[PDB]
Ligand binder design. Sequence first.
Ligand SMILES: O=C(O)CCC(=O)C(=O)O
Ligand SMILES: [Fe+2]
Length: 324
Amino acid sequence: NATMRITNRNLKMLTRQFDLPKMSSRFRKFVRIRRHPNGMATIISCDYNQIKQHLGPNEMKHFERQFVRLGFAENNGVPLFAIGVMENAAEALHDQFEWLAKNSPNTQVKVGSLTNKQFIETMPMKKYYESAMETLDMGTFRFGPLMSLSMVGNFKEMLDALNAAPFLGPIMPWGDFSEVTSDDGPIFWVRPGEQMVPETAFNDRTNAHADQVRVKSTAAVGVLQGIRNPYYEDERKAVKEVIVFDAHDLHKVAHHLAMDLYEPPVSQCHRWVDDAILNTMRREGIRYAKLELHENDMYFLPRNVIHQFRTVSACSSVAWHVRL
Ligand SMILES: O=C(O)CCC(=O)C(=O)O
Ligand SMILES: [Fe+2]
């Protein structure tokens, strides 16, 4: 009731100014739109675990397409939403980390160090997976992150799985909503979670950036799986803490953080954004949202949303760009 009332309130406020894509009354009740209390950017989400209990397979495909079309809605070239989240949508997706360990075990992967930024270790995928399993305990594992592995360069089975998953088909780089380029991905990686290491902190973080085709801004889409050694969904772990900035504030945010958007993402921003900075940025009228993403969630980031991710529990990500 309250969720629907708040979603309807926000839809009414947006429609007073902007022409939004349409959605049936029956589907609208599955959509959650809210503004972040402190930052005031707008988050759109849904819960696949709830949807799948009410909609048949053809109806769900219709919902998923309308949801993605609404979540990428723009006015005057500017996304209205700062992030879209499909909660639980990857629940039925096969275990991707295990798939790579069993089906591509000898692939040489690059692994970061928990203690030295300048160290990169090469080893077979299978040995990385065994190392992560061996050190996994209470939501983190005591081993380095896996550097991103392109799935597009056998991996067909992983791309087919994503292609068939909820929401994703139309917004794959080759999907119906795409204007198309292997630079788009998908890419796969694994993060072990922030943790103290024997003690010093391992910070598990991606600085603020805008995603780009390299230069044109682009949308990004991601899939999160918790790391598990082979269950109440409402208690599933938070895996990322996310800060997204309203796309309308791209230039204000970049100027405040002294970002060089010509740099590649990794070197666009040299300042970590924390609540002190967010509160100072708010005084300039910048809007943002801060939220957690949980295991088995999918998400997407419209173009020109500057965003910053922190890994708070061990997870795998599969992510790509889509030129809508
Ligand atoms: O997950 C991360 O650490 C960054 C993910 C991201 O930045 C994206 O999906 O565009
Ligand atoms: Fe990104």
